[PDB]
Structures are given as structure tokens and as C-alpha cells.
Amino acid sequence: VPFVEDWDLVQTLGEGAYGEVQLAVNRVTEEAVAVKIVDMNIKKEICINKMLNHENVVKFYGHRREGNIQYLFLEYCSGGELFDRIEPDIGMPEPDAQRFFHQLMAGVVYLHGIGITHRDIKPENLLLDERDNLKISDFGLATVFRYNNRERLLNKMCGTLPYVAPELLKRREFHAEPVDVWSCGIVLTAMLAGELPWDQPSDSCQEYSDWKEKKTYLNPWKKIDSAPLALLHKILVENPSARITIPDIKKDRWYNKPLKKGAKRPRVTS
Numbered sequence: 001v002p003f004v005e006d007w008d009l010v011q012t013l014g015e016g017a018y019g020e021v022q023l024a025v026n027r028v029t030e031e032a033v034a035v036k037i038v039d040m041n042i043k044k045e046i047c048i049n050k051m052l053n054h055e056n057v058v059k060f061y062g063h064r065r066e067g068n069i070q071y072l073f074l075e076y077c078s079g080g081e082l083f084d085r086i087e088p089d090i091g092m093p094e095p096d097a098q099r100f101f102h103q104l105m106a107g108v109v110y111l112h113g114i115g116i117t118h119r120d121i122k123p124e125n126l127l128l129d130e131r132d133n134l135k136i137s138d139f140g141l142a143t144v145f146r147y148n149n150r151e152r153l154l155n156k157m158c159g160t161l162p163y164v165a166p167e168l169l170k171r172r173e174f175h176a177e178p179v180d181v182w183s184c185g186i187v188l189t190a191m192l193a194g195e196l197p198w199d200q201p202s203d204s205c206q207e208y209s210d211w212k213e214k215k216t217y218l219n220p221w222k223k224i225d226s227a228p229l230a231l232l233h234k235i236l237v238e239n240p241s242a243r244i245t246i247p248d249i250k251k252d253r254w255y256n257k258p259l260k261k262g263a264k265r266p267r268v269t270s
Ligand SMILES: COC(=O)Cc1ccc2c(c1)NC(=O)c1ccc(Nc3ccncc3)cc1N2
Pocket: 011, 012, 013, 014, 018, 021, 023, 034, 036, 075, 076, 077, 078, 079, 080, 081, 127, 137, 138, 139, 140
């Protein structure tokens, strides 16, 4: 009973404009949590976080206000960022990328199902727990696109340019779901080639023009096997209304290709 509410801040997990994130350890139980410290947008992040409950979404335990400073208690992910599992210019083994992509789809399906769009999917925002289970992180740019079963079209510029869908730069209004599908396709590209295909998806970007002209003999596409590449051809489609939806990604051949063995379990012989 005494001291269970006490947490020691043992190290910095992240720093930025928002403030900082510290790894906190319970004085009594030694449970590890991530505490987001915002100097003080944050009201919306907390409200969205209160809605979330899924195995592939960073869990929100609660918040505390100490005058001006807000403390967000979040699920600690000991495996760090997916970003650091991507070898520059190489990527990672295709069965690992497939497993992470399955868990990313489960997370995004969940959020879209409750009418939430993350709006900044990228490997820095995809964390790994002790068993390498992927968790969608940081709902600071997230918003509600569906309420009372009515879709709201988005118009605000949100995200990170290499991961943003082309409609965000070309259209005044756009559907939220194809934008998250697109960023997931860029994450899959990064996992399989260890590089981003373009600085941004605009016609003034030579690499983006090459892709629309189907020059897949060029990098990063040359490093990707034909089966995951065929999926990327359906995701990285400029027209968001013609882009593949998640129910159709779940039917894709590479998505359902057996590649990955289960977690290595202890065994003996004779
Ligand atoms: C001491 O470090 C380690 O042992 C390995 C490590 C490194 C970076 C992160 C984590 C773990 N885990 C997080 O849960 C984590 C939690 C939060 C976070 N950043 C956020 C920023 C803003 N909002 C939410 C999360 C990054 C994170 N990455």
C-alpha cells in the first residue's frame, strides 16, 4: 500500500518541441512506464488516448497535472523504435518486415474502426515491446475523422513529408484513411530497402516521377522482391480513391505468404 504511487525517472526516452519522455520505474513494484512530460493540443491527445485499447497501440494508464506541467503515463516499450531495426540501405529480413506490417495493419484497422487517424505513421512512431510486438505511438497529431457514423473530410497539413500521401499536397480536402494506408506503404518500403523513396510525393520530385513511370529497376524498388513490390504498387497509388484499402491489403498475396517461423521456443533432443 505505501509508496506504490512513487516513480523514479531513470532515463530520457525522447526529447522534442512537445517536451520530454522519461522511463519511470515504480519504487515498490519496479514496473516500467513511459512518462510524457508536457511543459504546457495536450487536452486532445489525452482525450484520444483515453479511447484506445489495443495490443498494437501504446496503452494509456492515465494523466496527472502538477500546475503547468502535464504527466502522461504510457505503456513502456523496451524494444525501442522500429526505426533502429532498419539497417540503412539494406532494411531487414523480409519475414520480420511482414510480421511488423501485419501488426501495423492490426493497429491501424483498430484506430480507423474507432474513427481515429494517427496522421504521422513512420518508424520513429512504431515502438517494440520485450517480445518485438509493434505498438503505434504518439497521438499528438491524431484526430477524429468519424463521429456518430459520419465521416469528416480532413484539410490540415499533418505528418512528415517523406511519409505523406500526395493528396495532402495537392487537394484542399481528403479522406483520412487512404492517407494512413500510404504512410504504412512508405514504412513497408523503408523496412524492405532501408531507404525512403522520395523527399515528398510531388511531380517536381524526380524519384516520385520515376515510380509513377514504373521504373522499378531503380532504387529502392530494385532491392524489393516481386511479391511485396506488387503490394507496394497497389498502396503507393497517387489517386486516393483508387488506392488499395486495408480489407484488400489483407487479401494481398505477399501479405498472406508464409515466410516467418514463430518465436524460437526452447527444445531438447533424444
Ligand atoms: C532507455 O531506452 C531503452 O531502453 C530503449 C528505448 C528507446 C527509445 C524508446 C523506447 C525504448 N520506448 C518507449 O516506450 C518510448 C516511449 C516514448 C517515446 N516517445 C514519444 C514522444 C511523444 N509522445 C509519445 C511518445 C519513445 C520511446 N522510444
